[PDB]
Amino acid sequence: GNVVIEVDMANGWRGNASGSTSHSGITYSADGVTFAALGDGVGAVFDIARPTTLEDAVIAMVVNVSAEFKASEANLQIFAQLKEDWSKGEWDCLAGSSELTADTDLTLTCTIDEDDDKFNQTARDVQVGIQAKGTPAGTITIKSVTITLAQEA
């Protein structure tokens, strides 16, 4: 089959802010990575080390969303972007509030597919993560992230 990358859930993560609200970092636990969903654009990220062949790759995240997050009606966006060339990215993935629940774990997926093949490249690390969108509250826990490339292993 294809190349499968299993992301380390005990090292290498950071809080992230892509909007007008500052983040409060991340917290590691036996269950994975958790962040406080303080506002629109607040999330959690890690880096895929260069070089990358990420076009047509599938990102799958197992997550748990808190009751307060579900009540806030905010959405969840898996995204990826070129580190230090931030506007160049994959911005078309979204899980809306209506499809989330606080009652069980969920698997959210995102396919990277850019018309200019920006994600097949050697120059930059790629920042990948998940962020809240809208007017959020509560917390988000990431248990695992698995990336399946469009390349034979």
Ligand X SMILES: O[C@@H]1[C@@H](O)[C@H](O[C@@H]2CO[C@@H](O[C@@H]3CO[C@@H](O[C@@H]4CO[C@@H](O[C@@H]5CO[C@@H](O)[C@H](O)[C@H]5O)[C@H](O)[C@H]4O)[C@H](O)[C@H]3O)[C@H](O)[C@H]2O)OC[C@H]1O
Q: Which is nearer to Na ion, 16 or 64 (CB)?
A: 64
Q: Which helix (H) or strand (E) holds 77?
A: strand 75-82
| Helices within the chain (DSSP H only) | 67-72
Rounded to a whole number of angstroms, the minimum distance from the CB of residue 104 to Na ion is 7
Residue 106 CB burial class (10 angstroms; 0-12, 13-18, ≥19): middle
Q: Which is nearer to Na ion, 126 or 142 (CB)?
A: 142
Does 16 interact with ligand X (rule: CB under 6 A)?
yes
Residue 127 marked ligand-binding: yes
CA–CA separation, 28 and 149 (whole Å): 27
Does 20 interact with ligand X (rule: CB under 6 A)?
no
* CB-side neighbour CA atoms (13 Å) of 111: 5
Does 12 interact with ligand X (rule: CB under 6 A)?
no
Rounded to a whole number of angstroms, the minimum distance from the CB of residue 151 to ligand X is 25
Q: Which is nearer to ligand X, 11 or 87 (CB)?
A: 87
From 146, 5, 148, select the one nearest 63 (Cα to Cα).
146
* Residues composing the chain: 153
Residue 120 marked ligand-binding: no
Q: What residues between 86 and 105 interact with ligand X by CB under 6 A?
A: 86-87, 91
Which stretches of the chain bind ligand X, using CB under 6 A?
16, 18, 81, 86-87, 91
Q: Which residues are annotated as a binding site?
A: 16, 81, 127
